Enzyme design. Structure first.
Site, PDB file in Angstrom:
ATOM      1  N   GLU A 184       0.780  -1.316   0.027  1.00  0.00           N
ATOM      2  CA  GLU A 184       0.042   0.112  -0.073  1.00  0.00           C
ATOM      3  C   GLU A 184       0.973   1.248  -0.012  1.00  0.00           C
ATOM      4  O   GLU A 184       0.583   2.267   0.646  1.00  0.00           O
ATOM      5  CB  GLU A 184      -0.958  -0.077   1.120  1.00  0.00           C
TER       6      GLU A 184
ATOM      7  N   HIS B 180      -8.219  -4.363  -0.925  1.00  0.00           N
ATOM      8  CA  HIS B 180      -7.283  -4.164   0.380  1.00  0.00           C
ATOM      9  C   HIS B 180      -6.259  -3.125   0.480  1.00  0.00           C
ATOM     10  O   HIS B 180      -6.181  -2.235   1.274  1.00  0.00           O
ATOM     11  CB  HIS B 180      -6.636  -5.481   0.346  1.00  0.00           C
ATOM     12  N   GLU B 181      -5.551  -2.921  -0.648  1.00  0.00           N
ATOM     13  CA  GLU B 181      -4.375  -1.945  -0.869  1.00  0.00           C
ATOM     14  C   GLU B 181      -5.194  -0.615  -0.730  1.00  0.00           C
ATOM     15  O   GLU B 181      -4.504   0.321  -0.079  1.00  0.00           O
ATOM     16  CB  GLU B 181      -3.580  -2.055  -2.049  1.00  0.00           C
TER      17      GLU B 181
ATOM     18  N   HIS C  50      -6.078   0.549   2.752  1.00  0.00           N
ATOM     19  CA  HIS C  50      -4.854   0.971   3.535  1.00  0.00           C
ATOM     20  C   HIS C  50      -4.685   2.549   3.532  1.00  0.00           C
ATOM     21  O   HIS C  50      -3.834   3.072   4.442  1.00  0.00           O
ATOM     22  CB  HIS C  50      -3.567   0.247   3.113  1.00  0.00           C
TER      23      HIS C  50
ATOM     24  N   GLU D 127      -3.807  -4.574   9.447  1.00  0.00           N
ATOM     25  CA  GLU D 127      -4.323  -5.473   8.662  1.00  0.00           C
ATOM     26  C   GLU D 127      -5.825  -5.978   8.846  1.00  0.00           C
ATOM     27  O   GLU D 127      -6.616  -6.113   7.787  1.00  0.00           O
ATOM     28  CB  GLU D 127      -3.470  -6.707   8.384  1.00  0.00           C
TER      29      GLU D 127
ATOM     30  N   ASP E 131       9.589 -10.891   9.430  1.00  0.00           N
ATOM     31  CA  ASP E 131       9.275 -11.414   8.353  1.00  0.00           C
ATOM     32  C   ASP E 131       9.102 -13.164   8.657  1.00  0.00           C
ATOM     33  O   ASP E 131       8.364 -13.897   7.880  1.00  0.00           O
ATOM     34  CB  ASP E 131      10.325 -11.170   7.068  1.00  0.00           C
TER      35      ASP E 131
ATOM     36  N   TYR F  19      -4.440 -10.716   9.989  1.00  0.00           N
ATOM     37  CA  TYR F  19      -5.478 -10.426   9.071  1.00  0.00           C
ATOM     38  C   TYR F  19      -6.862 -11.182   9.433  1.00  0.00           C
ATOM     39  O   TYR F  19      -7.923 -10.339   9.242  1.00  0.00           O
ATOM     40  CB  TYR F  19      -5.159 -11.145   7.520  1.00  0.00           C
TER      41      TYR F  19
END
Ligand SMILES: O=C(CCCCCCC(=O)Nc1ccccc1)NO
Ligand SMILES: [Yb+3]
Ligand SMILES: [Zn+2]
Length: 607
Positions: free
Chosen positions: A269, A293-294, A297, A316, A373, A381
């Site tokens: 995003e 979704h993006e 954001h 998220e 990560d 989410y």
């Protein structure tokens, strides 16, 4: 509140207000070289030093008031990088601002960056560079307070070979030939809205654009422009719905950049310029939820931001919730519930993969000594989404809870916040329903591992056919196989076909004869939709179909979205027939992979 992923001075000591970045992209050396001018505001009396995050950066000098100053780089702390302490020349009073100009160069191994050779691109003539800073990779591009607790504006001037185009998470602010090197062009950028530094982004390559809406250009290499323009044509309609839900879109433009296939995520995003995987290019707009979704954001994440990465779910989970409302406004409330229920299934999967007591299955995660990560999953989410959907149902439904969401975005716009901030505001907004909110088991939802304590109610309309067909296959014996036929699929959308396969995959393996029958009657090998092909190939490898080995290896390596690449490599490593080839394949490709993906695949494969 401590940001346990950052080594920099915290926001309580000093705050970066602005970054001016002047740099040059040197494809021969795979280095970005230049100066990062940080405008920093003291938050303390008598401030005499501060510390910034860096990772694999070479520092040439640090200049304040026109003179070089002392600085020191501390020992590397693994993924966090190396702290850089800067000795200020004059002690600062509270609220005093100075400019600190750091000359630096990146490492070719920068974890923020992927450098692609001409062969690795569509056009095969020119090289390509792209960044991915979320969560804690901005420190591998430039020295900074690499914490989402600090928001800054930025300007940038980027020198590139003149045949190429640079774009950033910012408004384009001109281009001119580089006076220091006529082989180069400088592209300029301005980001006037304060952002966390994880939202800094850069792309350099042979890019072209096509307008697809009043505030949207699609950018890609020439070979992908036409397909991208069609695939993302819903973007203005989604932006309009999103503004209704969240309030005004504040960022000016909403452009899309379609990356080469090794981009590690579905989308990112970055403000003004969302990055997306070419794996969305299904031909029929069916994977457009990623765009929704993006877009979302732009409010939840970019305007209201998690104060530290332990509170990622704020970003998220609220985005998934807005994503699903955009798709429900477009395609109907039954589809919102279908997607919602699919999400719970993905949460089931993640919980089973980690284990029901695993710390990374908590909604609020403690990232002390944890690389984000490595902990990354569907949990923030989908446990996040499920909490919000459970609250929606408890508090009187979607119109009511959407009033809360808009109010929340307004309240916390331009700020960085914690779970408790969110919870406090939920209680303030809904003060007339506190008795309802007190039925919530907050400790279990926020802080306990595993599946949530309560599952929401879902409309089953679009799901029932998927489950029925899955169950038919699972319960089939050899003498039932002949009963399957292509007509079984005739009333199923691509989304339903995906959910049939996800339901089946949850019970994998199936007998090898069933899987061969499935290919004979449904010809799933022919489907190029990446989500469907992903699950189909997983189903085939887990069911020990050797003919699927080359197909799975091909998809794992021809693109690099981690969602697909990681589980395909893991499944291929777990199948004794493909194990050696999977490891060889990883070893052969690893130097040319995205650095984060390469890391994680190697961990997954125990290489
Ligand atoms: O949601 C997405 C896809 C993921 C983009 C990269 C997220 C990296 C990140 O912030 N990871 C992370 C943070 C906290 C805890 C664990 C991982 N796009 O909008
Ligand atoms: Yb003082
Ligand atoms: Zn997201």
């Amino acid at each position: 509140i401590v940001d346990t992923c950052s080594l920099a001075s915290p926001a309580s000591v000093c705050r970066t207000k602005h970054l001016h970045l002047r740099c040059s992209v040197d494809f021969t050396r795979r280095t970005l070289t230049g100066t990062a001018a940080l405008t920093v505001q003291s938050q303390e009396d008598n401030l005499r030093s501060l510390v910034l995050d860096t990772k694999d950066l070479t520092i040439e000098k640090v200049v304040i008031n026109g003179q070089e100053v002392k600085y020191a780089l501390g020992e590397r702390q693994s993924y966090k990088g190396s702290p850089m302490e800067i000795s200020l020349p004059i002690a600062l009073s509270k609220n005093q601002e100075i400019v600190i100009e750091i000359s630096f160069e990146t490492s070719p191994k920068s974890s923020a960056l992927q450098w692609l050779t001409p062969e690795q691109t569509s056009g095969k003539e020119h090289p390509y560079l792209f960044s991915q800073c979320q969560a804690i990779h901005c420190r591998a591009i430039l020295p900074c307070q690499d914490t989402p607790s600090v928001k800054l504006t930025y300007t940038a001037e980027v020198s590139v070979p003149k045949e190429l185009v640079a774009l950033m998470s910012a408004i384009r602010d001109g281009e001119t030939p580089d006076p220091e090197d006529p082989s180069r062009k400088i592209y300029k950028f301005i980001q006037k809205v304060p952002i966390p530094c994880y939202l800094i982004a850069l792309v350099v390559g042979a890019l072209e654009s096509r307008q697809i809406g009043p505030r949207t250009l699609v950018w890609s290499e020439k070979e992908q422009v036409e397909k991208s323009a069609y695939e993302f044509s819903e973007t203005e309609s989604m932006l309009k719905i999103a503004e209704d839900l969240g309030g005004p879109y504040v960022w000016g433009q909403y452009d899309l950049l379609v990356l080469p296939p090794s981009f590690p995520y579905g989308g990112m995003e970055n403000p003004c310029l969302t990055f997306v995987t070419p794996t969305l290019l299904a031909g029929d707009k069916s994977l457009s939820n990623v765009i929704a979704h993006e877009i979302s954001h732009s409010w939840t994440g970019n305007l209201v931001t998690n104060k530290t990465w332990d509170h990622f779910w704020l970003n998220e989970g609220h985005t998934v919730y807005l994503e699903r409302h955009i798709c429900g406004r477009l395609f109907g409330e039954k589809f919102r519930h279908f997607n919602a229920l699919g999400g719970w299934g993905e949460l089931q999967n993640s919980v089973k993969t980690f284990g029901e007591t695993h710390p990374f299955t908590k909604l609020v995660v403690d990232l002390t000594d944890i690389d984000p990560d490595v902990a990354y999953s569907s949990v923030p989410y989908e446990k996040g989404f499920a909490l919000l959907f459970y609250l929606e149902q408890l508090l009187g439904g979607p119109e009511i809870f959407l009033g809360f969401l808009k109010a929340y975005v307004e309240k916390f716009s331009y700020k960085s916040i914690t779970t408790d901030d969110w919870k406090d505001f939920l209680y303030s907004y809904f003060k007339d329903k506190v008795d309802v909110l007190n039925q919530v088991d907050w400790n279990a939802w926020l802080y306990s591992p595993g599946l949530p304590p309560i599952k929401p109610n879902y409309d089953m309309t679009l799901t029932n056919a998927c489950i029925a067909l899955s169950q038919r296959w699972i319960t089939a014996k050899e003498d039932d196989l002949n009963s399957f036929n292509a007509t079984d699929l005739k009333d199923l959308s691509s989304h339903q076909l995906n959910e049939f396969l996800a339901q089946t995959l949850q019970r994998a393996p199936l007998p090898l004869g069933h899987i061969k029958r499935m290919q004979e009657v449904y010809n799933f090998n022919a489907i190029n939709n990446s989500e469907i092909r992903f699950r189909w190939l997983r189903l085939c490898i887990q069911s020990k179909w050797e003919d699927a080995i080359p197909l799975a290896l091909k998809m794992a390596t021809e693109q690099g979205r981690m969602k697909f690449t990681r589980p395909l490599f893991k499944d291929l490593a777990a199948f004794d027939k493909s194990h050696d080839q999977a490891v060889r394949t990883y070893q052969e490709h690893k130097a040319s992979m995205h650095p984060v993906t390469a890391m994680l695949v190697g961990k997954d494969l125990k290489v």
